[PDB]
Amino acid sequence: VINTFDGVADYLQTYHKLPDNYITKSEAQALGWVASKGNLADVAPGKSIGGDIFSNREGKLPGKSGRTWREADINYTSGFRNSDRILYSSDWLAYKTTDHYQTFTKIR
Numbered sequence: 001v002i003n004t005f006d007g008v009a010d011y012l013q014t015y016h017k018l019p020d021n022y023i024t025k026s027e028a029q030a031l032g033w034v035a036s037k038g039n040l041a042d043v044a045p046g047k048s049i050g051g052d053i054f055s056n057r058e059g060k061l062p063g064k065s066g067r068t069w070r071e072a073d074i075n076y077t078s079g080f081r082n083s084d085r086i087l088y089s090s091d092w093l094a095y096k097t098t099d100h101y102q103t104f105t106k107i108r
């Protein structure tokens with residue numbers, strides 16, 4: 001699976017899509033994923049949560065009309081989700097967060 005900051009970052013900029021080990025939260029729920037139980041690895045082996053729209057309500061990531069922000073989990077293998085996320089824009093900007101969206105730094 002591609003689930004490293006660099007790996008994912010690089011695949012996105014070239015191919016313009018997340019690698020196939022990613023699924024959105026609603027797709028995972030539909031397969032039996034129960035967030036409170038941390039069972040993703042059981043119902044969707046080798047998948048990580050990724051691809052959902054990220055709000056940017058607190059305007060922490062730089063905006064621009066027509067720009068949409070998405071998120072993907074990084075370094076996830078099994079159990080409860082971690083605090084690692086890659087945030088990528090529709091124009092292929094890539095930012096990293098290791099602390100649950102508190103802070104971000106550019107990686108691409």
Ligand SMILES: [Zn+2]
Nearest residue numbers: 014015016017
């Ligand atoms: Zn393309």
